[PDB]
């Protein structure tokens, strides 16, 4: 099957109100850019953002000019006639938005609480989608936690069950309209509604991992913000995941959960493939079209794990851009991140930035060595192996933030489509390097082990294993004169053939 | 309020059917034993042991001598006119009847498994009790698995019941009827319901921690059975704790249960003490009145955390009998048990036994250089460390196991009632020594702290101290944006 080539389009409400083609500065990446070759390499546009009102429900943001709204929308709909499966969604939320303390998080909150505040919403949502032609509902919230898990999930639900009978109504059998989730990609978020994943998930075509930002000026080391493979010279981070309420045991908590571990691409992916109810067809990879900036970086390695003075406050409190050949940070005013786009740019100003790549993460990153600056970020090089890992893994695609962001000619994204469907790009040999793999195992993705049947009667030593009730369980001590199962002397391994 | 002193009296249906006092040959610790002095150092007397038949009831072992086993019992109670804060409960199950592979073992397991078996049951106890002249029912299952539980539970629960009730219909409020059980003293058997310790306290008046047997022939290496505290020199365990049905996250999990830690008296007051609910008062900590004897030790360490060669498995699997001065262990067919009175008799004896002393685990033992021997025992002197410890500690009193190996002389029931009674003891200069402490926090053990109360809308870095709830908590990362109990990133560290 056809892997999923989902490219975000982030435009913010001051350019659809000023939205031009034909200036640069005003709208630096517009629709015009995508051509219907373009079109054809992509499976979804996600159009973002929209978000949740004081009232409850889906809407733009009250500053947005409508027309120039529609028009946005409109130029993006349009491709649709290049590309027969191309889906226009629209994603709701986005880290401004919908975090903790972002500007709309109580309307996420409250929105989701009741079966009334959930079909309100969610019909909201079907309206939009059919108000402006989009093809499915893409929820962007960064990230719903304790009590609010369930509110979400029966959210999910419910706008699954109404984008189901408005494509019936539709007749849009042939292209369903969709339902999608970013995700997040690291443990510390991920640990907040992990517990629940398959509930989830279940009502989603796809849940979009975002596994990026893994790094940055808000952490005391430099690193790959999106390293596939571990770097044993890189930092490692506590597993939030065993934290969250599973009721696994100490031993289970322990092999799902190493600690310290590498925040990796792998390790997000792995950890959702680890819970019971998550198909891989459904999990998409995420990747970034930007890399993050550091500065004070000591030499010695490429400026990798390095202390840095890099302020990592919201928004960049300074005013000095120091990011070398960064004219988009000066214009954006924030030295600590960069497009692809400006990046390429950089490396082309001849500016003294030396294009490096960990062999073992399986990223690039630029070192200057002169002004002690340090970037992270994925090209089309880091895309083959991310492209090979999904395939390899069956997961449902690739994601990416952002479309706007890609070089003009859009080489990113065409690397992307080609690495899945180019007859004449073959990476059979490409090697996948010796990074270290995320390897926890939890009750959920347990091996086919072998034993004899457990024996009623019989004392087992320590390290004993036995079959029973479909599992193969393993002694913690001694003496054990207790059947597998619900007692704590009995570790559960492995499955039954 | 007077520490409890629980001495159990066990006496073999052999021993019951032949009953006499004027035969040690035959009932080597008859009541008379127990003078009117040695009434006065107890508060309870707990006969052992009753069992549950097959009609799923409280009863006497089968082959027991009704008539007997009502004149021992009614000598036992006649004890009381000595003592009017005398206790004589009766106290159903041990190892041999109780334990997962015992002679009774069904019986226990169905007893509790419906409301009517538990209300038959609970009903079969009272009157036992009323019948026979007991004054409470101590229930010693060793030990209901973790699906058997609720029922365990529900079937005290029944039993303080109807306990609760006689109490009132008999006017015993200046001496009510009393509920307690013989708990696991160690992790492993903890682990069974620890989960749950709360709902199985509430009940009772007393949970008897059979804190002792924490080594024996069936470890690899020998040790002391009953350490206060543990000596890093000595084996450790893997903390089963941490496996137990409780649903805590890892990090409290963690922080509650070190593993490997030391199998000791202390570790297991402290594991209970780190439940909610638990109120230190109706713990009791047991104390052994035999010691456990291995063979085959080598010297290094006067015989400790040495390999051996006994054999672990019951009953003694051969006719060799290695004690040297043991007589007991002749007549019992068993030389890897002896009662302290055998002990104290093989000490005085000179058959080459040393008496040494583990100051970090306050604990005596034998160790015999000639014929390689080992023995793990308690006596007056490592009871001084117990009772100051269960002192400190607020627990309600002591437990030992049991009456009959005593000295003729009651020396070791004595020491107990001296060392929380005598008006000339005092145990205040009494160090407790350098010996490892179970440093593991729970729930129900945590320490006050102060921190400023969490404030909604504030970012947090990792490791931040706030208060919330009447807790104080701590975040386990950085930049965390929500509040305590809402957000996993807390760990509740602190109260008040
Ligand atoms: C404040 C506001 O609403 N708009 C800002 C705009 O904010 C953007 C940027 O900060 C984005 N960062 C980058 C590197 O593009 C940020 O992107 C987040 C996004 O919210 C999350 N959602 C996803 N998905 C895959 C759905 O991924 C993440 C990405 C980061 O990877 O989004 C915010 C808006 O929430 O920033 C511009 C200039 O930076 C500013 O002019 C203004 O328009
Ligand atoms: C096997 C039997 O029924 N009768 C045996 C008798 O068995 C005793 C002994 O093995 C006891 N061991 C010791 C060291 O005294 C054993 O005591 C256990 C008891 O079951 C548990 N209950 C408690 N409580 C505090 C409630 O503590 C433990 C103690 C060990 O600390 O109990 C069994 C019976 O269950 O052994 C004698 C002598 O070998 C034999 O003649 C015969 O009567």
Redesign the interface.
């Known amino acids: 099957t056809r892997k999923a080539v989902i490219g975000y389009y982030f435009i913010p409400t001051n350019q659809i109100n000023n939205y031009t083609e034909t200036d640069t500065s005003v709208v630096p990446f517009p629709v015009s850019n995508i051509t219907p070759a373009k079109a054809k390499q992509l499976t979804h546009i996600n159009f973002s953002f929209l978000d949740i009102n004081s009232n409850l429900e889906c809407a733009w943001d009250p500053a947005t000019n409508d027309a120039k709204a529609r028009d946005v929308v409109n130029r993006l709909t349009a491709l649709k006639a290049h590309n027969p499966s191309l889906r226009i969604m629209f994603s709701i939320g986005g880290w401004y938005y919908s975090?903790?303390?972002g500007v709309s998080h109580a309307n996420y909150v409250n929105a989701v609480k009741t079966p009334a505040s959930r079909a309100k919403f969610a019909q909201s949502c079907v309206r939009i989608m059919k108000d402006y032609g989009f093809d499915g509902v893409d929820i962007d919230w960064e990230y719903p936690?304790?009590?609010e898990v369930d509110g979400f999930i029966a959210a999910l639900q419910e706008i699954r069950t109404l984008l189901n009978q408005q494509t019936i109504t539709d007749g849009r059998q042939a292209l369903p309209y969709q339902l999608t989730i970013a995700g997040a990609g690291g443990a510390?978020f991920l640990?907040?509604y992990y517990s629940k994943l398959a509930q989830i998930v279940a009502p989603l075509d796809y849940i979009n991992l975002m596994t990026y930002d893994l790094a940055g000026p808000?952490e005391k080391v430099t690193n790959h913000q999106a390293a596939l493979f571990g770097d044993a010279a890189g930092p490692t981070?506590?597993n939030?995941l065993?934290?969250?309420?599973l009721?696994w045991?100490?031993?289970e908590?322990?092999r799902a959960?190493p600690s310290p571990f590498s925040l990796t691409v792998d390790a997000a992916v792995q950890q959702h493939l680890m819970m019971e109810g998550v198909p891989s067809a459904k999990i998409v990879m995420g990747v970034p079209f930007y890399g993050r900036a550091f500065k004070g970086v000591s030499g010695g390695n490429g400026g990798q794990y390095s202390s840095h003075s890099t302020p990592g406050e919201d928004p960049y409190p300074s005013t000095d851009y120091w990011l070398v050949g960064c004219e988009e940070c000066v214009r954006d005013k924030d030295p600590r991140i960069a497009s692809y786009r400006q990046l390429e740019q950089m490396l082309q100003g001849n500016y003294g930035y030396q294009r490096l790549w960990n062999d073992k993460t399986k990223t690039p990153y630029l070192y200057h060595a002169q002004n002690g600056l340090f970037v992270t970020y994925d090209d089309a090089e880091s895309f083959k192996y991310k492209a090979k890992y999904i395939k390899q893994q069956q997961l449902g695609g690739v994601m990416f933030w952002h479309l706007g962001q890609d070089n003009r000619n859009g080489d990113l994204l065409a690397a992307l489509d080609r690495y899945f469907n180019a007859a004449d790009y073959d990476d059979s040999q490409l090697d996948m390097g010796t990074g270290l793999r995320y390897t926890g195992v939890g009750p959920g993705n347990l091996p086919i082990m072998t034993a004899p049947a457990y024996v009623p009667?019989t004392?087992y030593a320590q390290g004993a294993l036995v079959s029973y009730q479909g599992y193969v369980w393993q002694t913690?001590?001694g003496?054990i004169?207790?059947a597998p199962g619900?007692?704590?002397?009995w570790?559960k391994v492995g499955r039954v053939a």
């Open positions: 975090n903790d303390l936690q304790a009590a510390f640990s907040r808000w981070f506590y939030a065993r934290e969250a309420n009721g045991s100490w031993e908590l322990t959960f009667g004392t913690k001590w003496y004169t207790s619900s007692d704590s002397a570790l």
